[PDB]
Amino acid sequence: MVSLPRMVYPQPKVLTPCRKDVLVVTPWLAPIVWEGTFNIDILNEQFRLQNTTIGLTVFAIKKYVAFLKLFLETAEKHFMVGHRVHYYVFTDQPAAVPRVTLGTGRQLSVLEVRAYKRWQDVSRRMEMISDFCERRFLSEVDYLVCVDVDMEFRDHVGVEILTPLFGTLHPGFYGSSREAFTYERRPQSQAYIPKDEGDFYYLGGFFGGSVQEVQRLTRACHQAMMVDQANGIEAVWHDDSHLNKYLLRHKPTKVLSPEYLWDQQLLGWPAVLRKLRFTAVP
């Protein structure tokens, strides 16, 4: 890691917090990323000096192919602009992937997959990431970001998210007590979390990390789903139950605020959200 250049920016103020209305660091000292916590100029330099490549994965099966055009057009405007980006679009319909114009240093790969009926079959989602694609991802990108396709970017989503392992706060539960979280509560499931455990409720629509960490996570969740299946049990919220168990026991190195996964139709635009970056599409 070579030196940063001279840069002129406002001095950070030790006795003035950036945000006093929200928690900006976890008890395991991982930053919680809200608008006003970061200087993007500094972070962009740090990441550009490493020639960072970010992989973005989306599964668009059956009718979900319809969401690709807005998803990708808005990612071009808002997602890691200035950095190398590789989109990985997993789909049962290669021909229905729209031809979207990409900025320089950005590429898109279409990966054909079979469509499956049962939700357990559906989740090569945890499979696909680690198995057919593991070597390719290690060769092609530095970080992997895994998102839902029925979304659009509306504001900056950049290198402030990048870290070995990140999850995103469920926008419906960020103010909730742990008792209210919809974790898997049956002890017979591998995703089980009791009422007196839990940091946050993470939503599986936006997670990521280094390739290695994302692979570990996906390998672990896949194995846990397989064990539940053999025991005749399905976790209450499927992928997200297992994701929450994983991130309980392997703390993320950054947590993203609900700015990064929002639904404006369901939740409005509260004062605590200064920006709505990645949102559900009505």
Helix (H) or strand (E) holding 207: strand 206-210
Strands 278-280 and 254-256: unpaired
Helix (H) or strand (E) holding 214: helix 211-230
User: How many other β-carbons are positioned within 10 Å of the β-carbon of residue 176?
Assistant: 13
Which is nearest to 266 in space by CA: 281, 252, 277, 251? 281
CATH of 1-282 given 3.90.550.10, 3.40.190.10, 3.40.50.2300, 3.90.1140.10: 3.90.550.10
Strands 84-91 and 106-112: parallel
CB 30, CB 255: distance < 8 Å: yes
Angle at 191 between CA 277 and CA 183, to 5 degrees: 55
Which residues have C-beta within 8 Å of that of residue 63, sequence separation ≥ 6?
none
CB 105, CB 85: distance < 8 Å: yes
Experimental method: X-ray
Domains of the chain, by residue range, sit at 1-282
The per-residue DSSP string of 118-166 comes to SHHHH--HHHHHTTTSHHHHHHH-SEEEEE-SSEEE-S-B-GGG-SSEE
Count the alpha carbons within 13 Å of 3 in the hemisphere toward its beta carbon: 3
Give the integer Cα–Cα distance in Å for 147 and 72.
12
Angle at 253 between CA 71 and CA 8, to 5 degrees: 80
Strands 165-168 and 206-210: antiparallel
Residues 50, 77, 111, 166: what is their CA dihedral angle, to the nearest 10 degrees? 50
Give the integer Cα–Cα distance in Å for 30 and 22.
14
